[PDB]
Design a protein around this ligand. Sequence first.
Ligand SMILES: CC1=C(/C=C/C(C)=C\C=C\C(C)=C\C(=O)O)C(C)(C)CCC1
Ligand SMILES: CC1=C(/C=C/C(C)=C\C=C\C(C)=C\C(=O)O)C(C)(C)CCC1
Lengths: 212, 217
Amino acid sequence: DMPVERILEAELAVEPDPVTNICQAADKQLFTLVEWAKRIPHFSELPLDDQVILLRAGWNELLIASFSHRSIAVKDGILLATGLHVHRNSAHSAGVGAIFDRVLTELVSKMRDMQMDKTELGCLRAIVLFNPDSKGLSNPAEVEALREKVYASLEAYCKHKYPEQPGRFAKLLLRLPALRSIGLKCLEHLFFFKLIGDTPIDTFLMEMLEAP
Amino acid sequence: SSANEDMPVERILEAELAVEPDPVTNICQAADKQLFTLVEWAKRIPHFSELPLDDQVILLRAGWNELLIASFSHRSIAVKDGILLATGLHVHRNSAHSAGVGAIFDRVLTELVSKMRDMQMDKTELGCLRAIVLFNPDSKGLSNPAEVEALREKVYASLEAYCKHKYPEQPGRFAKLLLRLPALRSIGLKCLEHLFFFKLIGDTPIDTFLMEMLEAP
Ligand SMILES: CC1=C(/C=C/C(C)=C\C=C\C(C)=C\C(=O)O)C(C)(C)CCC1
Ligand SMILES: CC1=C(/C=C/C(C)=C\C=C\C(C)=C\C(=O)O)C(C)(C)CCC1
């Protein structure tokens, strides 16, 4: 009904050429994803092979959710975990303005235009993490159960805090479709970079693109 | 097995539909646009994703140009003496000749556009020819070319199986479809030459990923 502060705890523990910088910030946080998920109620009690499968599945959406929320503070830019700011002016000149602008309007803006609080960002991340449809899962039913628990606990949280908005929870969940979509597109750009010879051979991101 | 279960043509048609939207500058900008979508296109072709990432990239670096030419050629069946770019523009041969690329342009119109228009190639067929062009087991660098060859064979089977079921009174449609491959291969090599040439004479298209594909692996 409410392991919520454990989830916020997880989020606070992990965290502080334009493409090259974004990818290096990504490498940095991809690693912390291990410590982040381990601090998530019940995640550690799942078979090792399942924990790895869940992270290989949502790692990109998970990282995009995090830096997007961190960026609510600025405008027309994003704040990397390496302490750098990247302006959309730079995204465009480098060739990625389209997906960049999609991140700014469908994620950064929607979270700033409703004041998303870290505890909700942490919960959406946990819902993204507990995707029972991931291929290869030992017990997809237990994972599904865990997702449901984040749903319950999260809705329960929106009530205790924002009762004068008998909908908020539904508004939070509206970010999921965009994240899923933006996330798939980023994997494409990543493949693309390797396709055209400007592959970032110095990160671990490209290993995450391999087929399971 | 069943030819079509090992390589379903509805999945292949699906791939194609997901990606369907100075003359030279315009053609090159349409090319950049679709070069990118090639990533999403190939990811939807049955089994392409199950290959080692390095192989997927090698297959695309090898046939990207033939793959794009096949697509805009088919799209152009709709007009006469011109081609329809993915950016929504139409380019007439007259402008192509004024620019000095009327020779290859006419080759595309007669050896590809016309042949497809006349035999009424359908999107599923165009998609299968593209998949055959993609699974090229002779691409240098391949880690397991035997698996790629196997996949090509599956598209062949599945595609022949499709012509026989859909056009039962055209026994030689499959062989006729495959006749487009040699022209595509040939037209495709010539376009790489023109692309190099543009850079050679100082008319290199500014900021396009097109030029990046010309680098040697
Ligand atoms: C949005 C985006 C991209 C994808 C990024 C991914 C998958 C993760 C970034 C994580 C960071 C930057 C984390 C941190 O600083 O918290 C690419 C490379 C295609 C370039 C264009 C913009
Ligand atoms: C045929 C042709 C050329 C090559 C084009 C290539 C390699 C790709 C085009 C893709 C498009 C135009 C895609 C789309 O709109 O679907 C060049 C530049 C030598 C100019 C003369 C005519």
